Design a protein around this ligand. Structure first.
Ligand SMILES: CS(=O)(=O)NCCc1ccccc1
Ligand SMILES: [Zn+2]
Length: 140
């Protein structure tokens, strides 16, 4: 589980989005596994704008933050585990690291702020859904 709270936006894994998230839907993309919902409270997270390939992610299933190198955003095959058409997710950054389904929503951050959220796992790899190319999270 986990979300990003910037301004009046909540960013979550699309596949973990709640009835309330869908009721308050702002934007979603099935290919990117992202959903953004509107919030009444003002969020205090900052969205990195960069092409950093180093950062730290929170891994709930290890109660630990891991420093990682990660690939640039691209379209990738995600192997079966329990979820999705065990298929192709876009805007995905991979790193070598531990990821289970329950780790989705863990934040990846660099110096410039929040890079992305954990979106995939398996074979010793962790995949993160990049939010850096969603510049609109920054105003209204
Ligand atoms: C694959 S999905 O996430 O788009 N399926 C919808 C899940 C959902 C169920 C009830 C209410 C709102 C959302
Ligand atoms: Zn950065």
């Amino acid at each position: 589980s986990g979300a990003i709270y910037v301004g009046n936006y909540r960013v979550v894994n699309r596949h973990l989005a709640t009835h309330n998230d869908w009721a308050n839907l702002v934007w979603e993309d099935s290919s990117r596994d992202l959903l953004v919902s509107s919030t009444t409270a003002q969020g205090c997270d900052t969205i990195a704008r960069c092409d950093c390939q180093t950062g730290v992610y929170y891994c709930s299933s290890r109660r630990k933050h891991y420093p990682v190198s990660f690939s640039k955003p691209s379209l990738i095959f995600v192997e079966a585990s329990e979820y999705y058409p065990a298929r192709y997710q876009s805007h995905l950054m991979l790193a070598v690291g531990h990821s289970e389904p329950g780790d989705c929503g863990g934040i990846l951050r660099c110096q410039h702020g929040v890079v992305g959220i954990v979106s995939t796992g398996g074979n010793g790899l962790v995949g993160f859904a990049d939010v850096r190319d969603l510049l609109w999270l920054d105003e209204e």
